[PDB]
Design a protein around this ligand. Structure first.
Ligand code: PO3
Ligand code: CL
Ligand code: CL
Ligand code: CL
Ligand code: NH4
Length: 427
């Protein structure tokens, strides 16, 4: 009715609405208006001015009441004054996720939601679809907003979707919908648990018989899913579950490549079930799982030499991973090495300190750590052989010696450390 005089509003201007405005500037004839509660920085203003997008900052005014549609930033709360005025004046309210779901090919979307594990599970789905050779987009709440992907073409769009995005999405239709878990704590979400649940489950009740809904069966305690019309495959059942070492899908058993925490086992189970439904086969999934980056590393116990216990955490390539390994003991003689990531090690050192009987270092990471380590008994050596002997020398019967490097390299170091262990008589 209004041709190019359509007025499109943005309430809030975080990454969702910024990505959406950038898509619409290049795809739609309309007058655009951005409304920010705080101040916009200099770069953002220059950007809006370069494309003559009107804006207000320092408060939401009645200028938004003039809009034909307003896109709400996912973090905007439902009972705020501007939402109340907008609704009471009959202005249509939508959000960047809903726009995406209205514009993409529905059958190419894999929508993942959950309380825990959401980012890793989404990354795994992306990983295994990419590994089959599909051109695959990864984004959603934790990452790149989905509308970025509407430039060019993809085979699959793998989205992580939060309760906030789904709340503000009036009709969030997904052909492929995975719910990892729904849990009562901890929660970024404002208040009502029943609104949180209902927001997260919205897509399920929109599906048709040709669609797919894979879900954690514990959510059946919260909501009745009988009327959902899609192919529905629950996990944690008699046929779809995981124990510490095994994955069972359709009653079939597969050995997992390591013994992982509960959340990672659930992420694997969830994505398994969906992959098996899409491709009828899990051998390709398991092979691709092996190079999945967030996959926890094996901490291989090597054995003893003269009462000392050796653990090989060769794959720890960051401060974070070293802190993981450390939480398995109370005292340890620790060997670190490799190329230090650009970090601030004081946070790491104070967190590591109580667990360290002695720290041994070599490689360029020695230089990064040296300035913060005056606190604790420590030795800098030149290579792994020297590190090994120094570990034997500062240790006694009963101690644990742990290789957990913390830096990158140029199972090469791990192999080297194993070989040294053996040459000095290890088991
Ligand atoms: O945060 P507001 O719309 O009063
Ligand atoms: Cl705002
Ligand atoms: Cl904002
Ligand atoms: Cl998004
Ligand atoms: N936000």
């Amino acid at each position: 009715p209004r041709g190019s005089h359509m007025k499109i509003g943005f309430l809030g201007f975080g990454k969702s609405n910024r990505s959406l405005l950038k898509y619409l500037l290049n795809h739609q004839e309309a007058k655009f208006f951005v409304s920010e509660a705080k101040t916009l920085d200099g770069e953002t203003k220059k950007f809006l001015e370069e494309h003559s997008v009107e804006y207000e900052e320092g408060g939401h005014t009645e200028k938004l009441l003039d809009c034909d549609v307003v896109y709400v930033s996912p973090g905007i709360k439902p009972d705020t004054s501007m939402i109340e005025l907008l609704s009471s004046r009959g202005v249509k309210l939508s959000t960047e996720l809903q726009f995406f779901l209205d514009n993409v090919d529905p059958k190419k979307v894999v929508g993942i939601t959950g309380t825990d594990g959401k980012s890793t599970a989404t990354a795994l789905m992306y990983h295994v679809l990419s590994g089959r050779g599909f051109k695959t987009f990864l984004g959603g709440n934790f990452g790149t907003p989905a509308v970025e992907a509407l430039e060019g073409e993809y085979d699959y769009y793998v989205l992580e979707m939060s309760s906030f995005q789904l709340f503000w999405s009036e009709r969030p239709y997904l052909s492929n919908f995975l719910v990892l878990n729904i849990s009562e704590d901890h929660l970024d979400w404002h208040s009502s648990f029943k609104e949180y649940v209902d927001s997260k489950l919205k897509p399920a009740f929109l599906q048709t018989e040709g669609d797919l809904f894979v879900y954690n069966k514990h959510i059946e305690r919260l909501r009745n899913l009988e009327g959902v019309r899609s192919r529905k495959i629950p996990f944690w059942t008699d046929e779809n579950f995981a124990t510490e070492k095994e994955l069972i899908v359709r009653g079939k058993k597969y050995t997992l490549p390591g013994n992982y925490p509960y959340q990672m086992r659930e992420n694997i189970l969830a994505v398994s079930v969906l992959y098996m439904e899409m491709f009828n086969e899990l051998e390709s999934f398991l092979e691709l799982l092996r190079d999945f980056k967030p996959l926890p590393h094996r901490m291989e116990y090597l054995g003893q030499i003269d009462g000392r216990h050796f653990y090989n955490d060769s794959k720890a390539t960051s401060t974070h991973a070293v802190l993981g390994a450390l939480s398995n003991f109370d005292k340890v003689v620790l060997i670190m090495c490799g190329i230090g990531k650009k970090e601030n090690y004081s946070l790491f050192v104070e967190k590591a300190s109580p667990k360290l009987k002695h720290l041994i270092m070599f490689g360029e990471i020695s230089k990064e750590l040296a300035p913060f380590v005056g606190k604790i008994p420590h030795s800098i050596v030149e290579n792994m052989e020297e590190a090994f002997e120094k570990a034997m020398e500062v240790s006694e019967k009963g101690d644990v010696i742990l290789l957990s490097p913390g830096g990158a390299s140029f199972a090469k170091r791990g192999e080297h450390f194993r070989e040294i262990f053996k040459r000095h008589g290890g088991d």
